[PDB]
Paper text:
We use bacteriophage φ6, a member of the Cystoviridae family, as a model system to study the assembly of a complicated multi-shelled virus. The inner T=1 shell, composed of protein P1, forms a dodecahedral polymerase complex (PC) harbouring the three viral dsRNA segments (S, M, and L), the viral polymerase P2, the hexameric packaging protein P4, and the assembly cofactor P7. The expanded PC is covered by a layer of P8, forming the outer T=13 shell. Here we present the structure of φ6 NC to near-atomic resolution using electron cryomicroscopy and single particle analysis.
The six-fold symmetry of the P4 hexamer and five-fold symmetry of the icosahedral vertex beneath creates a symmetry mismatch, so that the structure of P4 cannot be resolved using conventional icosahedral reconstruction. To address this we applied the localized reconstruction method to P4 hexamers. Local areas corresponding to P4 hexamers were extracted from the NC images and reconstructed as single particles with six-fold symmetry (‘P4 hexamer reconstruction') or without any symmetry (‘NC vertex reconstruction'). This allowed a low-resolution structure of the P4 hexamer to be determined in situ. Our localized reconstruction of P4 hexamers that correctly dealt with the symmetry mismatch revealed elongated densities extending from 3 of the 6 P4 C-terminal parts. We hypothesised that these may correspond to the C-terminal parts that are disordered in the crystal structure. The sixth, unbound C-terminal region of P4 was not resolved in any of the reconstructions, and is likely to be either disordered or unresolved in our maps due to limited resolution of the localized reconstructions. Binding of up to five of the six flexible C-terminal tails of P4 provides an elegant solution to the symmetry mismatch.
Numbering used by the authors:
A (entry chain A), C (entry chain K), F (entry chain I): 2 to 77, 84 to 276
B (entry chain L): 1 to 77, 84 to 281
D (entry chain J): 1 to 77, 85 to 276
E (entry chain B): 1 to 77, 84 to 276
The structure:
């Protein structure tokens, strides 16, 4: 189940302070788009109210944003992916001047941010995620019908707005949030593929997503499976390590390589 | 050759209407998420049942084509380019099922509701395997040249993607074993930059979105997917398709080279089961 | 000459019925465009009236649509080849539920549809067509001045609309229509080249053209010459076999391979 | 060096006007078909004859340039190169149903149309043209300052409209017109390169240009030098032979291969 | 860790304002040339000096971020595509200096004003070399994940390209040793057809335009440049970057592989 | 210094004449754009007045167009580089019917036009330019801070308009003008790369620039260093020789190959 501890209730105020304190945006190949912080706060309030009506034990089905919120929009006419960078400007989510909040998951003493669970198709990413990682909240998005969908920890979303709402909203409260998968975004990345058979803005997006979680004290594990050649996966994994707080590589059902940025330092395997 | 409507199908009509009304769905490709008008599918089911009633249960595939039964065949309800910022359009994937999906005996025993993808190079024996080994109840024929399968009473000739989804969701929800030969009109018009495997990445997302659309409406559909891909990259593309569908079949030299089915007994790779 | 028999005159009514019975469209990389059936009927009536001015014998020059019709348009603001496929929709010309009408040309018992005469430049396609196939009507499009242009069977067109008018119009009446060449269309096909150095929509167009002829009981032979590498022609020919009712490959002035879908079944060489 | 107007040229003026008025023509590349204003070519012929009358018939190439004789040099009366082929339509200039008028230049008994003077850079194309071919009128387009520019046969143009005006205008009258070179058109041909490292519409354009000259009884030699690999030139030359009435290949200052479509048939070397 | 304002910096304030007003500048990429609003940089300098006055000259990088000091962070003053005719937009390159550039002691002795590119593969030791071996006065952090360098009092966290240029031109002109870790948010968003070396040609033009912008405002800036390039193609790109920057440093296996600096004693290669 | 001789003063009238006599344009992948000749004349007049105020000895800094002219625009809504060639038309600057004016620089008896100083990065182009070629006026564009910027011959420009103003303006008067570099124009050439890893319109632009100088009796040396592979430079230099009046190849700090079109003929090394 998804259980709401006193620790989560005590974080509600802090989560609001974090969201209000820093105005954030996101950019991909178009123009920077602001994130409406209010929506995330509204989601937290709705989750806590429902957790209250229950015995602290919540069902992932009941906490999906489409059910709790009237509108699921986070981003507040239309720009092409091939527009001059000087006409749109460039935005990256700012870093944290203070020391980031540490976590015990996915690794001991890991800083707040994003962890990328990498590997070829059928390498055992989903298996590693649910058996070895054991997340508190499992966001299921753009994945086919599996055994993980019947889990009470599973929260089924449709949009990128919904993913960020659940990730920032619940992650800030202290929950160990995971996403299986981020394929709907990755498989719709438009642009000229750079070195490694993948668009360069992919690495910028991982950093922007990681810093978004670092700023809101979230520890999120994302399954990242982009369309890349069997031999080019090693290069891409190395590049992703330079763009995320955590990185896990899967091969033949087992964990091939690891990287975690902890309070004890950067740890490689 | 005929399409027979059992009491089991008649009893599913209400259930199907509820499934459609219960969840609002959309679809996206490289542009803006587009809503699916559920009403049209319900209207199609009502028209099929009414005609099944006039005839003696038994129906001809020719008579159940949407262009004949419905005044308008539109399912999707100004114009966006395939190269527009992903943040200005947002991203949509059809949501998964929180409950256990309805199991089926076709195309494999104890299979979950969703989509099965019948892969293979040209002349690998996809259409042969589909009609001889699989034996579907309803055969949707789309963007295929004149073959023996067109003279079959199970054959329903469509022209649009809207029509394909109407027949697939409409009849599939009622319990019919629906098949699509081919899905090529869609595949050959996929605009975008080709990813690893000489095919657009959104192709795999579309298969998952189509699979979940059928999982939500308790459909068991087999779609024959013919990719414009090099002889050596077909193995990679299949491996990728397996991770995007409830069922996958590879064809090579008139036979079935590889299979994958997500059953109630678990995920089965290359089983000892004749189709 | 192009001789009009009583058999052709008796088909006029049936041709009009076939055209009115089914509304058709066509699509390439843009949006589906409807085919104005009326124009084809008007062309048939004009050919029959001229046939009547002569002794049933017609000169190919006199039956060109630009001469017989006030407007040659068949397709009834502007869409790019890289627009969302969900905004335009997808269209394929529907198949025939009934048995297709059989023909004696280009092969015995062949079903109505299209035959693709393939081969490298100077492989003998035009020679094979005019000497071995010997068509009743020879549509000449996008080909330089040759001996075939002085033939009374030759009808010189300029547009794709004109090609379909003569192909559907005369083909429905029972004439053995041939197109040399379909290069104006092929060489202007915009889009990213798929496996085999050719746009994938090329194979969809051949199927849509074939089914358009199957629906109107036409037996047409089109010279399909692709800008493809000398060794990649075998792959493309195999791909075309899956998209047409007939397929003929030319090499060194001789017929290399054949494929025909007949009443006796699919025949390979 | 001078351009002399014979009685034979004066007697062709009426016929030339009759050929231009008889058939309405257009041209297409990757966009939409654009009509050719025939009147402008007639106006040019009348201006050349009027000047030939004032002088002794001995005209200077400098004095017969369209920019000097005509107030407006436009022959064609905004669409992207990546637009749906069904929204623009397809156009190819129609073939001649009658036998084409034969010429003694560039080869004996050659049919009216276009001849492509091919070869690598510095293979001796310009040398072969002026020394071995000896053209009556030498159109100079997109070429650096050479000895051929000081010639009284040289007519310096700037636009494609001007090229067609001088080619059709003077060529119809019986003059042996040559173009060195067609490089500004070829190097501005936008689109995805097909087999041989060159856009497929290049071969369609050569056929459309050839048929335009076949219809107006012109015998034109165009030096065609597209950006192609040193070893891929043999493939491209073979493909061009299937798209033109004449084809000449240059290597090490000499003529490597030749192809001409004559009244005695197609002659290869 | 702190950012100290010397009398030398205070004496440069007037000169900096003169340099900015004297020459109107612009920037171009694949679109149309866009003017740089000089006033914003002057306003930033005034805000930094006023805060340095309230403190004891000792400033925290966090307090000097433009988003905190300025109401509006825009430097560039409807929308053009990256594939538009070059003749319809025109071409702009920031002009060179007719006079001798103002030399510095950092990143190398007697190096002319401009930009230095800190190159290398991912995890080659660029960030390590920057903070340990280079020791910058001001460390601009942009498009980089949470690291130890973010807790430094020299660290100034930006979000936009406008902010980067404000801090680089503003503080660099006063004489500060400014560094950017990194410029990945601009590089990874560079739209266009990749030229020889698996990278867009306008990348080299941008480095020269950025270099000259610093040369004109007597700025000594070190930018870590890490574009998506193949493991073996990095040598070619580094050689090409040397022809586009005043300084160039290559990193390999945590150490400095190669160097290039344009100094008063001449161009020095390793 | 930049010294103004009586020979330069005597050319002022001839320069205005040459400029008024022929209206010119320029085209790249868009539409042809006219060059305002008046601006070049205005620049010449401002340079001569300043030369007359000073001792004839000028400073490159004082003759920059941005300082002498109120507006630096030469070209007089927005077209994409992928637009139909038939909708924009094609323009090439016309050739000279008369003999081009000869020069003693960069080679003896060389015709007026452009010389391309080619080579890989650090091949010695800028060293060869300033030590071996010794230009009168040195235009500095798109280059980092070097020793050449402190020179009194150096004139710092920002736009393509400014480059043409100084090149045509001072070049017509008899000055030996050089551009280091033309990289801001080369590196911003949008379009599909042809054979040799470079856009085909690059060669057309060199010919158009050369002919622009041939028409205005200029002798200009431009260092041309486009992004091309280390082994593909030989092919490109070969194509450039067919597009310019002069061509110099640099390697290992010295001159590898040369080509000059002189009054004594074309000289190769
Ligand atoms: N092609 C295959 N053949 C056999 N077993 C496979 C195949 N693909 C996947 N599997 C099995 O599935 C497991 C991986 O499951 P899963 O976690 O869902 O992979 P992923 O999330 O990386 O796509 C493997 O460890 C293996 O047991
Ligand atoms: N090139 C060929 N030569 C011979 N037989 C062929 C050829 N292509 C296909 N076939 C035959 O057709 C069968 C496949 O038919 P079909 O099911 O329609 O293929 P698909 O649907 O995959 O295109 C093969 O098993 C074989 O008997
Ligand atoms: N380059 C060539 N050299 C010699 N003969 C050739 C050449 N190209 C074609 N031919 C001749 O022309 C014949 C083919 O003519 P044709 O039917 O017009 O070819 P296609 O229509 O395929 O282009 C060949 O069989 C051969 O006799
Ligand atoms: N790189 C070169 N080295 C030596 N001679 C050359 C070179 N390029 C051209 N030539 C000379 O120029 C002649 C070709 O001149 P030209 O007719 O103008 O060629 P093209 O028009 O094909 O470019 C050759 O026969 C040769 O004598
Ligand atoms: N894949 C790796 N395996 C082991 N150590 C690594 C790896 N990647 C980076 N490192 C360590 O990190 C150091 C580089 O850190 P850093 O300066 O942040 O690199 P960069 O800024 O170039 O990405 C290396 O010297 C090494 O000690
Ligand atoms: N990578 C390098 N390593 C060493 N010296 C170099 C390098 N690149 C250039 N040089 C030096 O600079 C000289 C070339 O200078 P320059 O003319 O400015 O080059 P460019 O051709 O880029 O204009 C060479 O002769 C050599 O002394
Ligand atoms: Ca998975
Ligand atoms: Ca089939
Ligand atoms: Ca032929
Ligand atoms: Ca030449
Ligand atoms: Ca770093
Ligand atoms: Ca240099």
């Amino acid at each position: 189940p998804i259980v709401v501890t006193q620790a989560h209730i005590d974080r509600v105020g802090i989560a609001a302070d974090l969201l209000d304190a820093s105005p954030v945006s996101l950019q991909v190949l178009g123009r920077p788009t602001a994130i409406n912080t209010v929506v995330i706060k509204t989601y937290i309030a709705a989750v806590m109210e429902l957790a209250s009506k229950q015995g602290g034990s919540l069902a992932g089905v009941d906490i999906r944003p489409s059910v709790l919120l009237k509108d699921t929009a986070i981003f507040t006419a239309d720009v092409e992916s091939d527009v001059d960078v000087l006409d749109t400007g460039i935005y990256s989510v700012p870093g944290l001047a203070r020391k980031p909040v540490t976590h015990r998951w996915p690794s001991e003493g890991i800083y707040s941010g994003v962890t990328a669970l990498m590997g070829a198709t059928g390498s055992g990413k989903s298996i590693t995620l649910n058996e070895k990682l054991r997340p508190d909240v499992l966001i299921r998005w753009g994945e086919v019908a599996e055994a993980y969908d019947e889990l009470d920890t599973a929260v089924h979303i449709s949009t990128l707005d919904e993913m960020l709402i659940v990730c920032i909203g619940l992650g800030a409260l202290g929950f160990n949030v995971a996403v299986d998968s981020v394929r709907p975004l990755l498989f719709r990345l438009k642009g000229a593929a750079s070195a490694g058979g993948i668009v360069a803005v992919f690495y910028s997006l991982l950093t922007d997503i990681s810093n978004l979680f670092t700023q809101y004290d979230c520890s999120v594990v994302m399954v990242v499976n982009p369309m890349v050649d069997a031999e080019k996966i090693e290069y891409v994994f190395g590049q992703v390590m330079a763009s995320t707080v955590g990185a896990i590589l899967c091969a033949d059902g087992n964990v091939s390589r690891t990287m975690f940025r902890t309070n004890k330092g950067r740890i490689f395997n």
